[PDB]
Amino acid sequence: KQGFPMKQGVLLPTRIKLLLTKNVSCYRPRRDGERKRKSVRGAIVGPDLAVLALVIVKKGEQELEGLTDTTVPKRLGPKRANNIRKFFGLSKEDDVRDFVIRREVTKGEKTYTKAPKIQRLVTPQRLQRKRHQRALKVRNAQAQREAAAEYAQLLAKRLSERKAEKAEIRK
Amino acid sequence: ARGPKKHLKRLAAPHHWLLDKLSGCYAPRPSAGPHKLRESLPLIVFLRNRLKYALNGREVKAILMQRHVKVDGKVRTDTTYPAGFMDVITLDATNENFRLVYDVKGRFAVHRITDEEASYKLGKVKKVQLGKKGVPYVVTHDGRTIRYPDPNIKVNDTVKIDLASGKITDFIKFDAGKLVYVTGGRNLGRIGTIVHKERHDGGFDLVHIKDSLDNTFVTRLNNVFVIGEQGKPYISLPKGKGIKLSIAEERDRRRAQQ
Amino acid sequence: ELTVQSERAFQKQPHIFNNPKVKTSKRTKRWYKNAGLGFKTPKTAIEGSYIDKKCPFTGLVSIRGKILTGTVVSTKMHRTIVIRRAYLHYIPKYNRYEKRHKNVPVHVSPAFRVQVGDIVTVGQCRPISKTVRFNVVKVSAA
Amino acid sequence: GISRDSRHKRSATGAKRAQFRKKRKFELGRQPANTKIGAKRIHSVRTRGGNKKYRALRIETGNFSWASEGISKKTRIAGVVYHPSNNELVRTNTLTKAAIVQIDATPFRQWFEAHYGQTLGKKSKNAERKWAARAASAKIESSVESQFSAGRLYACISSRPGQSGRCDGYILEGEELAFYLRRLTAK
RNA sequence: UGAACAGCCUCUAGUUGAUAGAAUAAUGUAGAUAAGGGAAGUCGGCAAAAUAGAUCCGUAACUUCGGGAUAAGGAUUGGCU
RNA sequence: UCUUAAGGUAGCCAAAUGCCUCGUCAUCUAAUUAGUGACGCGCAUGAAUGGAUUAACGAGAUUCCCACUGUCCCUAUCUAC
RNA sequence: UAUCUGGUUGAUCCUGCCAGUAGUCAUAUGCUUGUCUCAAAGAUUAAGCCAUGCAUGUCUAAGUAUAAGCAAUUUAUACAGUGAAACUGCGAAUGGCUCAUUAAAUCAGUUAUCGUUUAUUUGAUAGUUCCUUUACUACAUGGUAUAACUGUGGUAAUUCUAGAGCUAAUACAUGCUUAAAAUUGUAUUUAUUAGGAUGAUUCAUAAUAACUUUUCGAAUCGCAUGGCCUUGUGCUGGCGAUGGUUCAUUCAAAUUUCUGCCCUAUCAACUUUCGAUGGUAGGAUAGUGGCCUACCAUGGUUUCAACGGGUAACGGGGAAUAAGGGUUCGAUUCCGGAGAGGGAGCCUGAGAAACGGCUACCA
RNA sequence: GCCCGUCGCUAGUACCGAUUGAAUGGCUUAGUGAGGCCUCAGGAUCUGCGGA
Structure with missing residues (x-):
């Protein structure tokens, strides 16, 4: 009652307040870094509860109405390339752009299939970018090597000029 | 003040920007860039008020975004890019080409140049x-x-x-004879030749600069900018060639060219 | 103090290595420098046995900024002295001066033997202590 | 938080300064690490500018350098024996800078035996020629001569475990080793 | 033990004398303890309770300048290495 | 103006001395014949029949406050004889 | 525009103040009130309290869209356009207000960082990412979640949300394609060695032996789709955006040198138990430092006005009035401080002791 | 002529004054001491000998 969720981890049948940080239940932060003292309830089940949420880990021998008799299908299928491959049992080389789930949507009389865009899907765009990165790095390597050699030769010429000046000095 | 400041007011703006004191609360605060907030000309003030090309900041932004404008060799799109002392600003769509430079009064001139010099x-x-x-x-x-x-x-x-x-x-080396551009101090924009330096230890170094008319003055070495040989500049200078005549001489010149 | 290694620790110049495996001459390797601005490093700072990590010549303290001159008035502390920088403040309304004095604690290296009443020139450095900011570089007395 | 400002300390003339501003983050201090020995446990503390500092505790081993040889080996730490600042750190085996510590001797001993072919206390042709070239290098002083027999080396900790997370150090040698040994045996 | 020919326990020495046995009612004499309140009791804080040794800190009005003063008010206290 | 030898001066007080009187005012309390400070035509204060004040001291008399409590609300229990 | 006048007396000459006179971006108030421009405006007493509603949110071609949204694949079967909701990245640390606290404090001029941090911008900058030293690598390229959603709900109530099933990344946790040129990156830390610039350095940089729980060195996105043939979804290939280590730059920040502040002796000695001044060493810091800690010496300030007290005291640029000197004022439009009712603590972040962010107490 | 003081009335101002007077603010000994933070541990639960 009063709608305070049971927190997983705290061992007491009462309601106590904690400083709920990020990545913890019973609290949705509104700002980066904010930690607000909420009120939760202990993991101990007591008479003070209003609803208790349970999950059927193993079905009994007789079914229930809005339950194991009836199933609700998963709303969205896999969207990433490898997720689709694993969920459809595809191999390393089968095409995935055709196995994609084509959910049918009808605006009145006009019907069309909306399939998810595939991410992490190898594409000539990605390969072109990879080749461009390789070309950029190798071009930079050639440029640095040639600049280093050029400055080495310039410094060698300057030191030769210094030696010539030393020879010219002292008559 | 518990962080960087992201605003500037008209009174606090540098004087050589020549913003009026009554049109708006704030001044265009330059973003981080090649030059300091002071001694630098933003593109918004170089277009809206210097060249009068755009009437408002929104139109300056539109000019910047359609990419007509490029400082140095690269196109700039930020509204308040800090274009500094010798930065070359193209405006290729109108085929002009300016290099920023201080007039003898001590303000960024609108001196135009050719592409054959803008290439450097x-x-x-x-x-x-x-x-x-x-x-x-x-x-x-x-x-x-x-x-x-x-x-x-x-x-x-x-x-x-x-x-x-x-x-x-x-x-161009720094020694006696070289023509220099005084960028800083009371002689903002003045041009002359070096006769000798002082080179104090620890303190600010000093240089004695004389110009074409033999008006010797002194300036800190932190405010000088050697720009070419003796009477042989490496750049084109604005009108006046970095000589400041007296107030009476300026008045006489104005009345003679009336 | 009397003995060089007095404190509970060992006193030596950091990153200075004696290399005890070489039997060279002069049996020491002392690191010194010149503070600049024409300030001559004393021969005591050249050849002495102390350490004084705060000495401008041997320690890792660099002199920069205001160079000041005063007359010391206290030497009871350890390797630190206090100078009385007298000056004449000017009152505009009455158009004449008034005597004023300031005391600036200044660190002193063992390279100098200072006495109360001498005239010493010092230079600004990084904060040595809560109030000490300068180091003595030349003394004068007769 | 621990405040590093001088606005709380009494003025040089004994003047009680007044509270000017509330405490500030750019002057905050943190508690000492107090690094013990055994079962390495380094906690990362974020520092101004988004930098990282390795607040070390319970460090296992450290890199210790034999400055005369120029080499440095990882070595397990036997424990502190003398600390110039406080004897409490010695008593509770705390690892901080300038701590005189005992460490293991086997890595350095094996390196000495394999690099100069000698021994303390008590075979290929290239090895014999190398040892002949490096002859008279067993002239290592009596301190470390008996040290390696004792099986533990006295080393000064030169790192800051509360800052860098490592307890790197260098082997005591010569005058400073003699000084610290004299301090140990002063009784 | 402790400041102590204080109190408490023991040694040498001396006593073990004072009518005694059985039960544990009231009222007594002597000793005590009491929840909450805290002098509302009573002529009156009578009786009782409270504090108490030592070390360190801190100590007012007034004063005959000597005191007030252990003022008031606080902290610590064993064992062992 | 009567009169004495002189007519209570300095001081102090409902004081341990003031009948009326539980005087009048203030403070202390919720409430005060109590306490204290003032007022003094003081039945009947007052100057070595010593006046006034007084630091310290007091098994002297009195009021209030803090602490403390079976004094009490409101009694109960235990031990010895 | 360097000026005075009435008033003590029967009358005179003085001291002497009262009064008159003028200004006040100096306030209030009384009376009266047509026009133009300009414009201050809850500072004074209460930094006293606050009903109510607003003031911080934000997307491109270019992070993630199968909304069971709109409009279309007249460009397309993975998507292709737009696009709510939401995750992600930034910002919210700017601005605005007030002047309570503050008397060497702030602040002004002037210095230093050889004493340090620095998101962003700008410019440079990772063959050694095979280094755990050639598949750890899947490299025509990898792993799991989890948001958004439907449905079940609790609470009188909150910008409360639990339990279940879905799903992406420039979100997280991994990880190669680097040949091999020489003699093994970079990042951290330790010790040793050499040492173009500065007035000066143990500087910059380089070489060794290693250490490291390990940082970084591109699995991101949008357009254009071009050249080579031994024509293959082959090899090469442009414009960018985003990201990245180090260095420099910029925006800054924190400390810092000298000098300077109103009235007070009816404030003369103060600081120093347990930090006071200094030394050694260590922690801590982004960094110097009694910033803190341990040991040690007894020091530091002061009649050239310390310490203490008051300030109807934020400091300054400046304002009013002045022959010259000067007097008074400066809450307030600009700069720098400090505060979000008082006080402290802290997360996130480059940046906060942040309050239109949390935590606790007090009111 | 001028003028002084006591006393008498009215009004105002300040002072002494029992009341261990009373408030407001600052600093502080001592006692209690929330809270977040660092740290020694505790490890619900979730995940591939381990990790959170």
């Missing part, structure tokens, strides 16, 4: 070090860094930088 710029090398892997490098007054300079190039010299690619076209 100068920079007073402000520091020389050896970077990583033992590689020497120079850094100029606009934060621009050039690796592998000539060993003869030292601090207080000028390096000619091609806008196509950062590379030392040539350099």
